[PDB]
UniProtKB/Swiss-Prot annotation:
Gene: LPMO9A
Glycosylation site residues: N33, N110
Reaction(s) catalysed by this chain's protein: [(1->4)-beta-D-glucosyl]n+m + reduced acceptor + O2 = 4-dehydro-beta-D-glucosyl-[(1->4)-beta-D-glucosyl]n-1 + [(1->4)-beta-D-glucosyl]m + acceptor + H2O
A Gene Ontology molecular function term of the record: metal ion binding
Protein name (Swiss-Prot/TrEMBL): AA9 family lytic polysaccharide monooxygenase A
């Protein structure tokens, strides 16, 4: 159970973005229905009044929270991977538009899931803004909590993988457009019951055997990391 508070650009806090440049849902409940239109940008998908201005090669950091800024972030029980996608704002996220910029699942060396490292990073994870065409974009940050993912929601609606999805409105101002954005996957539609990494037993299956859902990260990406960039409590 987690939400996005706002973003930082190049280590500078852009301020509270909820319902301003983040298409915030009304609460921190997960999305579980893989076929639902809620899979695109969560349950209140509408244009919000501002977009954060960035340039290609900028570092964009999402900051998640549970109940209040810079708290426990997300329950430690919620092991799973993190991904970030981009689409043009003109799509409103409909069709084969979403391109993967970042994926983190299990780190064998540290023996930690992306979600565990996000708690240590005080809710912060980053991508580098790619050299795409200037204009308006949607950045979709997705946390997948796998603690009830031994079952499929489609078969048992009280269990299943839990999706914590947030969409930020980003305006890319300065870019040469040297890596124009390629065709994307649809949300809903990319994840199905047979997709690797949607049905997984984290209690019995070694985390080293986990494969994150396709698609793979775009070669044009520069992303990116889970790591604290700024101290919230100095503001
Ligand atoms: C899942 O979402 C689809 C498409 O919106 C819908 O038809 C179906 O009723 C949903 N399943 C449940 C259990 O609500
Ligand atoms: Cu939760």
């Amino acid at each position: 159970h987690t939400l996005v508070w706002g973003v930082w650009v190049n280590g500078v806090d852009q301020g509270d973005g909820r319902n301003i440049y983040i298409r915030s849902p009304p609460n921190n409940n997960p999305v579980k229905n893989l076929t639902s239109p809620d899979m695109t940008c969560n349950v209140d998908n509408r244009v919000v009044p501002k977009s954060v201005p960035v340039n290609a090669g900028d570092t964009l950091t999402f900051e998640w929270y549970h109940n209040t800024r810079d708290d426990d972030i997300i329950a430690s029980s919620h092991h799973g991977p993190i991904a970030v996608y981009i689409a043009p704002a003109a799509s409103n996220g409909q069709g084969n538009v979403w391109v993967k910029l970042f994926e983190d699942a299990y780190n064998v060396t540290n023996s930690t899931w992306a979600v565990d490292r996000l708690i240590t990073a005080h809710g912060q994870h980053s991508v580098v803004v790619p050299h795409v065409a200037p204009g308006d974009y949607l950045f979709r940050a997705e946390i997948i909590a796998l603690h009830e993912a031994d079952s499929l929601y489609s078969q048992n609606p009280i269990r299943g993988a839990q999706f914590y999805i947030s969409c930020a409105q980003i305006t890319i101002n300065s870019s040469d457009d040297s890596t124009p954005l390629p065709a994307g996957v649809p949300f809903p539609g990319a994840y199905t019951d047979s997709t690797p990494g949607i049905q997984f037993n984290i209690y019995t299956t070694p985390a080293t055997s986990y494969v994150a859902p396709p698609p793979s990260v775009w070669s044009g990406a520069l992303g990116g990391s889970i790591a604290q960039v700024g101290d919230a409590s100095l503001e």
